[PDB]
Amino acid sequence: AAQTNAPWGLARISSTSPGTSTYYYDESAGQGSCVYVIDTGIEASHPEFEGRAQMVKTYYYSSRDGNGHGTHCAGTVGSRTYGVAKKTQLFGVKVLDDNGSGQYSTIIAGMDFVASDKNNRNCPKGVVASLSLGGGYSSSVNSAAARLQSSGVMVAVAAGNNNADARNYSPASEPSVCTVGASDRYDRRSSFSNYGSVLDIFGPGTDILSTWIGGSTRSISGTSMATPHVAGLAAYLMTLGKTTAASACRYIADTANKGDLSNIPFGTVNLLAYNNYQA
Numbered sequence: 001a002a003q004t005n006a007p008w009g010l011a012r013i014s015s016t017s018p019g020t021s022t023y024y025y026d027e028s029a030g031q032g033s034c035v036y037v038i039d040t041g042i043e044a045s046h047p048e049f050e051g052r053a054q055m056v057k058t059y060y061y062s063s064r065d066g067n068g069h070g071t072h073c074a075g076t077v078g079s080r081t082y083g084v085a086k087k088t089q090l091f092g093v094k095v096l097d098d099n100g101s102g103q104y105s106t107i108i109a110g111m112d113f114v115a116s117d118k119n120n121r122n123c124p125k126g127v128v129a130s131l132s133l134g135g136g137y138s139s140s141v142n143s144a145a146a147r148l149q150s151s152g153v154m155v156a157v158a159a160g161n162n163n164a165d166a167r168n169y170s171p172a173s174e175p176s177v178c179t180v181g182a183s184d185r186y187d188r189r190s191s192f193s194n195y196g197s198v199l200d201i202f203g204p205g206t207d208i209l210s211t212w213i214g215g216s217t218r219s220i221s222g223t224s225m226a227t228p229h230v231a232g233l234a235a236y237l238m239t240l241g242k243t244t245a246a247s248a249c250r251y252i253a254d255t256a257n258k259g260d261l262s263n264i265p266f267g268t269v270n271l272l273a274y275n276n277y278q279a
């Protein structure tokens with residue numbers, strides 16, 4: 001399939017070159033996979049989700065997204081226009097308040113929730129979790145991310161937006177999950193993106209158009225925006241049978257565009273997520 005006039009990040013993950021505007025992908029489109037978006041919630045009623053999104057858990061007075069951040073990330077995973085995996089099922093877990101903040105103890109509870117809740121969902125092709133959040137290093141937060149991964153969920157986490165070494169942030173610093181840095185439309189490391197040996201992959205993160213609350217859309221930037229590209233990519237590849245939750249991060253690194261990004265510090269991977277789709 002080909003989506004013309006796609007957001008640049010979509011076109012980028014199906015391209016060997018920057019500077020194109022069509023997204024190419026296999027029509028299976030993540031059908032039969034599921035992606036948990038652990039964030040501020042999802043506006044599931046947005047027409048862009050086509051009934052494929054739902055809230056499954058909140059730790060606050062509402063499961064509605066009063067911020068927009070979770071809806072934007074969910075849109076990059078799987079919305080019809082802005083999404084990598086356009087037929088995946090989306091499950092929202094609201095661990096962050098409407099100001100985008102959440103306690104680590106709630107975030108941990110949300111991760112253990114997904115590890116169990118996947119057994120209450122139909123995801124024959126596999127399960128992904130997208131975690132566009134983090135704070136300072138915590139071994140308990142990292143351990144929760146490792147349990148979720150161990151349970152058979154492909155965990156993608158944001159590297160963080162401090163222009164710093166991601167070793168000092170969690171869950172970014174957990175080795176067993178997929179830590180995602182941010183790039184821009186000219187194949188430059190995003191100005192804010194964290195870096196370091198713990199990063200596994202980069203995805204599009206600067207000026208990313210996606211869904212927003214109020215049935216709207218907007219373009220925002222962050223490693224929070226790169227992470228759902230990788231999570232949607234994993235769901236898409238698992239539906240194709242090319243990889244599994246346990247192997248998907250290594251597979252995406254194996255199949256990435258290599259050495260194409262600028263301003264990558266020495267010792268940080270120079271790998272850009274790529275679906276390797278041949279139309």
Ligand SMILES: O=c1[nH]c2cc(Cl)ccc2o1
Binds near residue numbers: 134158159160
């Ligand atoms: O301190 C922070 N803020 C963060 C935001 C994201 Cl998306 C990831 C890690 C973080 O660490």
